[PDB]
Design a protein around this nucleic acid. Structure first.
Length: 212
DNA sequence: ACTAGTAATAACTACTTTATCTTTTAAT
């Protein structure tokens, strides 16, 4: 069971690294191709107990992502040591985010999170905090065959689409904020994503969805 | 001293709602 837990944790860590890379943050090539043996050597102790605090890391946007998107800052990924998430731990994490001027931060829990923790999540302005479940991060959803590629559009691209189609913001097809693809991409309200899809009538098709 | 008008005598599926629960938090 310990080996299964370690393998699942390594898969979740790889999925988080891939998600950070897809968002435009720079991840080193050696870290992306980290093997299971290296992860167990540098994280697990002699008794095999995982070190959740050691997995927390920091990432910065690439210059290409910097010029493409002007709203990207520093990224901090933290893994909760304990299974449950009390209000005190969330307050401590929010204080750390405020004191370490992080633009965005990803918090990952094991079992569940208290509703009081979700009560105060809009009180972290200007920073943005996202909550993820580790068990939900075992398998990368974006690698599924049924899930096409989503690319977040810039403000200029969204504007150009709007004058090209003579549209309003509410007339576009809509994508929910709780959509797992939207949560993977960290979508915010009013942001449009372009989707390239296979089609049996024309080969390639392009769709656009605006976040709710 | 009699008569006739005359008026009153359904299951299937879904949503919504309620009370129950209880876990949560700060208070004993």
């Amino acid at each position: 069971d310990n080996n299964r837990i370690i393998s699942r944790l390594w898969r979740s860590f790889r999925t988080v690294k891939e998600m950070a890379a897809d968002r435009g943050y720079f991840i080193s090539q050696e870290e992306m191709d980290q093997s299971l043996e290296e992860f167990r050597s540098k994280i697990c102790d002699s008794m095999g107990n995982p070190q959740r605090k050691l997995m927390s890391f920091l990432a910065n946007p690439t210059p290409e992502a910097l010029e493409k998107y002007s709203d990207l800052g520093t990224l901090w990924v933290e893994f909760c040591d304990e299974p449950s998430v009390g209000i005190k731990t969330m307050r401590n994490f929010c204080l750390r985010i405020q004191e370490k001027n992080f633009s965005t931060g990803i918090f990952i829990y094991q079992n569940n999170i208290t509703p009081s923790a979700n009560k105060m999540i809009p009180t972290v302005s200007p920073a943005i905090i996202e909550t993820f479940q580790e068990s939900d991060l075992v398998v990368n959803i974006t690698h599924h065959e049924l899930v096409p590629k989503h690319i977040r559009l810039s403000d200029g691209e969204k504007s150009q689409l709007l004058q090209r189609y003579k549209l309003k913001e509410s007339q576009l097809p809509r994508i929910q904020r709780e959509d797992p693809v939207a949560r993977y991409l960290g979508l915010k309200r009013g942001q449009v994503v372009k989707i390239i899809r296979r089609s049996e009538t024309s080969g390639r098709y392009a769709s656009y969805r605006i976040c709710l």
